[PDB]
Write an enzyme that holds these catalytic residues in place. Structure first.
Site, PDB file in Angstrom:
ATOM      1  N   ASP C 349      -9.303 -14.525  -7.324  1.00  0.00           N
ATOM      2  CA  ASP C 349      -8.625 -15.269  -8.336  1.00  0.00           C
ATOM      3  C   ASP C 349      -7.317 -15.965  -7.723  1.00  0.00           C
ATOM      4  O   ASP C 349      -6.692 -15.297  -6.972  1.00  0.00           O
ATOM      5  CB  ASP C 349      -8.423 -14.456  -9.483  1.00  0.00           C
ATOM      6  N   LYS C 460      13.775 -37.332 -18.815  1.00  0.00           N
ATOM      7  CA  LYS C 460      14.209 -35.868 -18.816  1.00  0.00           C
ATOM      8  C   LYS C 460      15.194 -35.706 -17.936  1.00  0.00           C
ATOM      9  O   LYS C 460      15.077 -35.693 -16.539  1.00  0.00           O
ATOM     10  CB  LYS C 460      13.137 -34.941 -18.744  1.00  0.00           C
ATOM     11  N   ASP C 690      -7.015 -10.515 -12.065  1.00  0.00           N
ATOM     12  CA  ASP C 690      -6.021  -9.999 -12.957  1.00  0.00           C
ATOM     13  C   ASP C 690      -6.173 -10.396 -14.490  1.00  0.00           C
ATOM     14  O   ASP C 690      -6.123  -9.544 -15.293  1.00  0.00           O
ATOM     15  CB  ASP C 690      -4.647 -10.495 -12.469  1.00  0.00           C
ATOM     16  N   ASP C 694     -11.203 -12.811 -15.606  1.00  0.00           N
ATOM     17  CA  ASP C 694     -11.748 -12.118 -14.566  1.00  0.00           C
ATOM     18  C   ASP C 694     -12.583 -10.799 -14.866  1.00  0.00           C
ATOM     19  O   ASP C 694     -13.342 -10.011 -14.112  1.00  0.00           O
ATOM     20  CB  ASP C 694     -10.644 -11.518 -13.379  1.00  0.00           C
TER      21      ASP C 694
END
Ligand code: H0C
Ligand SMILES: *[C@@H]1O[C@H](CO)[C@@H](O[C@@H]2O[C@H](CO)[C@@H](O)[C@H](O)[C@H]2NC(C)=O)[C@H](O)[C@H]1NC(C)=O
Ligand SMILES: *[C@@H]1O[C@H](CO)[C@@H](O[C@@H]2O[C@H](CO)[C@@H](O)[C@H](O)[C@H]2NC(C)=O)[C@H](O)[C@H]1NC(C)=O
Ligand code: CLR
Ligand code: CLR
Ligand code: CLR
Ligand code: NAG
Ligand code: MG
Ligand code: MG
Ligand code: NA
EC number: 7.2.2.13
Lengths: 32, 291, 996
Positions: C349, C460, C690, C694
């Site tokens: 991941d 911005k 995590d 997953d």
């Protein structure tokens, strides 16, 4: 007479051997 | 899906032909070397022992005390009438005493007439092969009176009042030493204390001792034991066809239809005992003449 | 009918988010500014269930204890105990004075299973025990607007269809449908893996509910801003709820170590029953009746069962798991300690696993030069040059012009792991200035802020003016930050080494290429500029009220760009390299954007530098992507949008022809589909993650690895291994230990399997040659479960013979834990020598005591008889029953001693599989103690007072101790020449036939 065997001395030596080899092995796994 | 048996690319039972030959050839050479090694070491082992004496004899320190009717449980149960009930006993007695007949002991080159009276030990030199084949003292069936073999009465010893002879475990170089004249309460026995190994039978408790009425012993010259003139043993190699002494015991006054325990204890200084082996020195029997 | 329930959960979710505010309020019946009456809330609360996932399925402790009492090895010992009591029942009811040997053996097998269950259970229970000490579930109350009033209630008391308000910092309670936002940014990292804080707008943007901004999600955190929304999904019906429920209801599979143990038992019982049956027929062919032959069949089959190999294998696994727990790499399942070594494809991941999942200042621009800042999690990298004036100006522009400050308890915590209040970008800037430029507290209050301008919705820009505390100039210091395209339009001066210069294109274009370099690298870049306001046109008393043009928008002095991104963890790249070195295919599987996923892939090692994607070749040749042949592209990025339209064969081809693959924008369900695609090839898979996405991937994988702190609870429970320190290098440690303990298990198994030949051959030739029993039962127990236990346990402590992190992952269809080579060694060659040594000591004892070996044939007939007290030996002596039995038992004792003596050499040779003992070396202290204790225990069993009574083991005459020495030396020399030909000749004979 040949019909007698000193089994006590051999037995005693075997037990002393068993005690010494085990305490030596313990010293082996205790490297300090 | 389990046809790994074969394939068109060569495999049998799992591997190819050329592989089967390689493995088989290896295993044959490997196991062949293993066999040759075990044989060579076992040969050295054979070279460390002699032919006239076992290198160790402490495991047979107290000689045993066996009997002729090798019962399945040391019990003698039969019928005084039925001849087939006691066939298993008589068969073993005849086969045991088949080597003691007067015709079996006929060669004078290997047999020696000891004597009608038990004498001192007969030592035939050392145990080496420097001397020829030693002589074996004769022991005729006549010594066991009323329990003899096929001489005048092939009584079969079972028409009531059976016979049970005892034998001392044959040990090489064993010199029996009977108890001193200072006999520590050894149950009425003859005064022939110096040249015969005493053996006395009895019940086992207050009950068996009462059921067994009278016992009659038979031996060499009439002594209840083994004569010292037949010892020591010089091995099967140097003394083949050796005849160890025998001694019969008859139980005349028994309580028929009752199983009673008898303990034939052999006495002596060189005769040990054991609470674990009821045969070392002593001997037990469970007689029951059920009519 | 649970199959359909799981299938409707493997599908990506649907929704009704694309609805007008009136259609939504009509479907749900809810006031857009007042919510609903508390009556309706309680009516739904007591209608479908509180807003909370159903607790996990509780696992009673007696169930898992019964689990440890079963399995595959303990089951073989169970069938052995059953056969033991069967043989004892037969022997009991059919013959006179039956012996208690078989009964003793059955109770021993039962005790073995019970003891293994007690400690293996205590270990797995200890893992779960220390795991429960990590559930720090703090209740979180949500802000709900009901009946026109604001109230903060428990998250479980929230229902469907009611107004809910969230503030920057608060956690999104349920799945909301945003109705009104105010510059609101949520954090979809734990759920969809989107790293940067994704903003949430009320307008529907994408057909996918996950990508659109009008949906807030369960377990997500509103980073900044405030927003409102109607609860669409509640409880288990939520997005993360369907994901977690899918995770719990998935299959675990069969671990590789377990399959190896099962195949091992296949060979053990195969030869066991072959021997038992061939000898059953052999015994019937000789003379023994069916009653006796049945006992022979059971005895030979039961004798071929390694009684102690269960405890040794258990301790082996436990020892390696101990080393795992030492490095904070806890394993929940015991055998899971081995799976890392057998892995050959790691699916990882990105957010939170490959990366630190935290905005961090990556690179800076100054003097037309790129300066890379240290982005490690523990600050152990190269520090840039911090002695220039451009840095002293840029650092003040960032430390001053930023709406980021530390909180209350942010004192003892480090500069990075501490909590910062505000925007993620401003947090990264504040941490970098607080780390590489002293402190921002006294640096911010040193320049008193006068008038500020926050970030604007269009163009911005964020600016502010401050007083100047320098002891040489009282001019006002104006600073401004913003997107580089917004600042380039409002700049004319450029700072360099302390002085200014015009906006010459020779260095301005050099700024543009730097912007596209830091941008193309997947990072987010910002521009910082400042200017000295003339105190003659704007004195110290003038107040620049924020209304009109009081500050010059243009003609400013640009100092430099400052990029930022979530950096990978410290040992992550090196670890990826180590895994690739061990031949493990590394495949990234993340739901993040591909433009960032590809950059992190190239940065960690999944995509090797130089390898090109199918798109990179089309870009280098300026040709359409449809032209290039995919075979010319080693690596490839696969988008989740395209993944939805894929078949099984297509995914198989993606994995077969592409060596470096990166799956981007993939949903959790697609993560599971990817794991399944990897398993279809037949390779061991390890999923490292995590977030909750997953969970279905860590569950279905052969082994899941969750992060111990940066991970979510669902994926942490659905995983099989936890990294309590989040040190991804623990994966490398795991793949090393998994191979290490595998080879050591091979050695230890060959050790216990070698002693079987001299344990059974006495009974075999006892049946064939009709000789007295050479080896006893209780003595066999003293060998398998007595002496040999310490040597076999010490064989786990053996180290690597060569570099294991160098060899390729073991093929599951080829490298079996117990292949046909180990059987050819233990049962075929070494055990055979040990059996011959035992028979040698046997014949020595009997020949010296009067029974010549040639005379021992056909002797057991009358030898075992309990009443023939005149058994002639070879010298004509008459032996009673107990006398010769004393010799037989005092003949069993040296056979047992002979076993220990040959086990010395067998242990030394089993310690090394290929190396020589001279090379490896007797450095294993546990093995040294194993031999000392083994020998001392064997001697004690023979010479202790009362052993010929209790265990029927009698004392030995000293010469017996030397009857086994030549066989041991022979074993050692033979195996040493074996390993020598294996070393010198690595071709095939000694290697493919004996090397196991
Ligand atoms: C061929 C037999 O030999 C003998 O027994 C063998 C077999 C078995 O009985 C053993 C135990 O009981 C077996 C055991 O089974 C397997 C073992 C546990 C096995 C192992 C498994 C393992 O995991 O590690 C080791 C290896 C061998 C083993 O360790 C033991 C060793 C001791 C044995 O005693 C050996 C007996 O002489 C038997 O005879 C009689 O028992 C007998 C009679 C029988 C029928 C009817 C009337 C009878 C009357 C009798 C009167 C008086 C005395 C006996 C009578 C013979 O039939
Ligand atoms: C052997 O058996 C015979 C019987 O065949 C016994 O002879 C009897 O002996 C008693 C004296 O004890 C006499 O009163 C009988 O008249 C004898 N009968 C016969 C037929 O001879 C003889 O005593 C037994 N021998 C021993 C030693 O007991
Ligand atoms: C042989 O044993 C019998 C017992 O069976 C003895 O005779 C018994 O003597 C008791 C008195 O002590 C009487 O009550 C019995 O009636 C007798 N029975 C018989 C059959 O006579 C006998 O004395 C014993 N004889 C010897 C020589 O020991
Ligand atoms: C190959 C070498 C290094 C092994 C070293 C250990 C050897 C020398 C040891 C291990 C066990 C030992 C035996 C242990 C038990 C007995 C009984 C005792 O009452 C006399 C000594 C005697 C007979 C020992 C002789 C020496 C012996 C064989
Ligand atoms: C039939 C049997 C006993 C043959 C015995 C031969 C054995 C004992 C001989 C053959 C070759 C010898 C080895 C030759 C090479 C080495 C490497 C050196 O650095 C240490 C000595 C060592 C380890 C020797 C030990 C003894 C050895 C292994
Ligand atoms: C080339 C060389 C190394 C071959 C060595 C062969 C030696 C080691 C073999 C040959 C004969 C064997 C001996 C045969 C006889 C005995 C007596 C017995 O009570 C103990 C075993 C013992 C002591 C054996 C020990 C090993 C032995 C000495
Ligand atoms: C034993 O003592 C008795 C008298 O008490 C005596 O008649 C006999 O001869 C003695 N025998 C020996 C061998 O001393
Ligand atoms: Mg994540
Ligand atoms: Mg075993
Ligand atoms: Na699993």
């Amino acid at each position: 007479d040949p019909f007698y065997y000193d089994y006590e001395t051999v037995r005693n030596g075997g037990l002393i051997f068993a005690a010494l080899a085990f305490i030596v092995g313990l010293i082996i796994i205790l490297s300090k | 899906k389990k046809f790994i048996w074969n394939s068109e690319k060569k495999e049998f039972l799992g591997r190819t032909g050329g592989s089967w030959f390689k493995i088989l050839l290896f295993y044959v050479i490997f196991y062949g070397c293993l066999a040759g090694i075990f044989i060579g070491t076992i040969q050295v082992m054979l070279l460390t022992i002699s032919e006239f004496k076992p290198t160790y004899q402490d495991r047979v320190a107290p000689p045993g005390l066996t009997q002729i009717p090798q019962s399945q449980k040391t019990e003698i149960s039969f019928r005084p009438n039925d001849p087939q009930s006691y066939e298993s006993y008589v068969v073993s007695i005849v086969r045991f005493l088949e080597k003691y007949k007067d015709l079996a002991q006929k060669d004078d080159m290997i047999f020696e007439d000891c004597g009608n009276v038990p004498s001192e030990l007969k030592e035939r030199g050392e145990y080496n092969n420097e001397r020829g084949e030693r002589k074996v003292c004769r022991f005729r069936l006549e010594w066991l009176g009323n329990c003899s073999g096929l001489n005048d009465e092939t009584y079969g010893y079972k028409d009531g009042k059976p016979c049970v002879i005892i034998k001392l475990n044959r040990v090489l170089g064993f010199k029996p030493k009977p108890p001193k004249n200072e006999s520590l309460e050894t149950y009425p026995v003859m005064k022939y204390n110096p040249y015969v190994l005493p053996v006395h039978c009895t019940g086992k408790r207050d009950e068996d001792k009462e059921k067994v009425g009278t016992m009659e012993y038979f031996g060499l010259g009439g002594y209840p034991g083994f004569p010292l003139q037949y010892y020591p043993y010089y091995g099967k190699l140097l003394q083949p066809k050796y005849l160890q002494p025998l001694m019969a015991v008859q139980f005349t006054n028994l309580t028929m239809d009752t199983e009673i325990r008898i303990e034939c204890k052999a006495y002596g200084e060189n005769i040990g005992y054991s609470e674990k082996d009821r045969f070392q020195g002593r001997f037990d029997v469970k007689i029951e003449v059920k009519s | 009918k649970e199959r359909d329930m799981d299938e409707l959960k493997k599908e990506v979710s649907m929704d009704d988010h694309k609805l007008s505010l009136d259609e939504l309020h009509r479907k749900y019946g809810t006031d857009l500014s007042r919510g609903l009456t508390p009556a309706r809330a309680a009516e739904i609360l007591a209608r479908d269930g509180p807003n909370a996932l159903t607790p996990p399925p509780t696992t009673p402790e007696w169930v898992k204890f019964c689990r440890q009492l079963f399995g595959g090895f303990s089951m073989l010992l169970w069938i052995g105990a059953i056969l033991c009591f069967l043989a004892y029942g037969i022997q009991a009811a059919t013959e006179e004075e039956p012996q208690n040997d078989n009964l003793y053996l059955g109770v021993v097998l039962s005790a073995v299973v019970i003891i293994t269950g007690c400690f293996s259970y205590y270990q797995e229970a200890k893992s779960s025990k220390i795991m429960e000490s990590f559930k720090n579930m703090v209740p979180q109350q949500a802000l709900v607007i009901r009946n026109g009033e604001k109230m903060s209630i428990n998250a479980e008391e929230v229902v469907v269809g009611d107004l809910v308000e969230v503030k920057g910092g608060d956690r999104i309670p349920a799945d909301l449908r945003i109705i009104s936002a105010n510059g609101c940014k949520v954090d979809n990292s734990s759920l969809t893996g989107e790293s940067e804080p994704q903003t949430r707008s009320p307008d529907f943007t994408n057909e996918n509910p996950l990508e659109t901004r009008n949906i807030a999600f369960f377990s997500t955190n509103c980073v900044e801003g405030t927003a409102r929304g109607i609860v669409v999904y509640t409880g288990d019906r939520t997005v993360m709820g369907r994901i977690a429920t899918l995770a719990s209801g998935l299959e675990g599979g069969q671990t590789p170590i377990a399959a190896e143990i099962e195949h091992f038992i296949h060979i053990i019982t195969g030869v066991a029953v072959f021997l038992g049956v061939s000898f059953f027929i052999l015994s019937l062919i000789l003379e023994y009746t069916w009653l006796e032959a049945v006992i022979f069949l059971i005895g030979i089959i039961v004798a071929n069962v390694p009684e102690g190999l269960l405890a040794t294998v258990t301790v082996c696994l436990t020892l390696t798991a101990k080393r795992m727990a030492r490095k904070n790499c806890l394993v929940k399942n015991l055998e899971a300690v081995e799976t890392l070594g057998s892995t050959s494809t790691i699916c990882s991941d990105k957010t939170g696993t490959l990366t630190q999942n935290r905005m961090t200042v990556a690179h800076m621009w100054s003097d037309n030069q790129i300066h890379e800042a240290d982005t490690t999690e523990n600050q152990s990298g190269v520090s840039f040059d911090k002695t220039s004036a451009t840095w002293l100006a840029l650092s003040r522009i960032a430390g001053l012009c930023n709406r980021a400050v530390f909180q209350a308890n942010q004192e003892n915590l480090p500069i990075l792991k501490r909590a910062v209040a505000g925007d993620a970008s401003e947090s990264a800037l504040l941490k970098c200035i607080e780390l590489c430029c002293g402190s921002v507290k006294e640096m911010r209050e040193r320049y008193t802020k006068i008038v500020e301008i926050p970030f604007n919705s269009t163009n911005k820009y964020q600016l502010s003016i401050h007083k100047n505390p320098n002891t040489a100039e009282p001019r006002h210091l104006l600073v401004m930050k913003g997107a580089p395209e917004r600042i380039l339009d409002r700049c004319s001066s450029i700072l360099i080494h302390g002085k200014e210069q015009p906006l010459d294109e020779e260095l301005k274009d050099a700024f543009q290429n730097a912007y596209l370099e830091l941008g193309g690298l997947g990072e987010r870049v910002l521009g910082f500029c400042h200017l000295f306001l003339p105190d003659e046109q704007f004195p110290e008393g003038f107040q620049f009220d924020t209304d009109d043009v009081n500050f010059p928008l243009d003609n400013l002095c640009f100092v430099g760009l400052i990029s930022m991104i979530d950096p990978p963890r410290a040992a992550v790249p090196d670890a990826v390299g180590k895994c690739r070195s061990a031949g493990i295919k590394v495949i990234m599987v993340t739901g993040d954007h591909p433009i960032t996923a590809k950059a992190i892939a190239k940065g960690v090692g999944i995509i090797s530098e130089g390898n090109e994607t199918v798109e990179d070749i089309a870009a280098r040749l300026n040709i359409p992507v449809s032209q290039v042949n995919p075979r010319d592209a080693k690596a490839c990025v696969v988008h989740g949008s395209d993944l939805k339209d894929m078949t099984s064969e297509q995914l198989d081809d993606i994995l077969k022809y592409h060596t470096e693959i990166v799956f981007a924008r993939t949903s959790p369900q697609q993560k599971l589909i990817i794991v399944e695609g990897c398993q279809r090839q037949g390779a061991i898979v390890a999923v490292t993650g995590d977030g909750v996405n997953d969970s279905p991937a860590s569950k279905k994988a052969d082994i899941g690895v969750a992060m111990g702190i940066a991970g979510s609870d669902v994926s942490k429970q659905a995983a099989d291994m936890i990294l309590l320190d989040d040190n991804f290098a623990s994966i490398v440690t795991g793949v090393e230990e998994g191979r290490l303990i595998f080879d050591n298990l091979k050695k230890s198994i060959a050790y216990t399997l070698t002693s079987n030949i001299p344990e059974i051959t006495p009974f075999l030739i006892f049946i064939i040659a009709n000789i007295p029993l050479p080896l006893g039962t209780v003595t066999i127990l003293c060998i398998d479960l007595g002496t040999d236990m310490v040597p076999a346990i010490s064989l786990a402590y053996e180290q690597a013979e060569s570099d294991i992190m160098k060899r390729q992952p073991r093929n599951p269809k080829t490298d079996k834990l117990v292949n046909e080579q180990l059987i050819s060694m233990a049962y075929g060659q070494i055990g055979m020598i040990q059996a011959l040594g035992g028979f040698f000591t046997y014949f020595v004892i009997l020949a010296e005591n009067g029974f010549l070996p040639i005379h021992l044939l056909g002797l057991r007939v009358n030898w075992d008889d309990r009443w023939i007290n005149d058994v002639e030996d070879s010298y004509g002596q008459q032996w009673t029953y107990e006398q010769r039995k004393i010799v037989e038992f005092t003949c069993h004792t040296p056979f047992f001693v002979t076993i220990v003596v040959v086990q010395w050499a067998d242990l030394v040779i089993c310690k090394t599989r290929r190396n020589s003992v001279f090379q490896q070396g007797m450095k294993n202290k546990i093995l040294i103690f194993g031999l000392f204790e083994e020998t001392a225990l064997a001697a004690f069993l023979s010479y202790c007072p009362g052993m010929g009574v209790a265990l029927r083991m009698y004392p030995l005459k000293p010469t017996w101790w030397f009857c086994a020495f030549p066989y041991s030396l022979l074993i050692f020399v033979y195996d040493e020449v074996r390993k020598l030909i294996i070393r010198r000749r690595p071709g095939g004979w000694v290697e493919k036939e004996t090397y196991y």
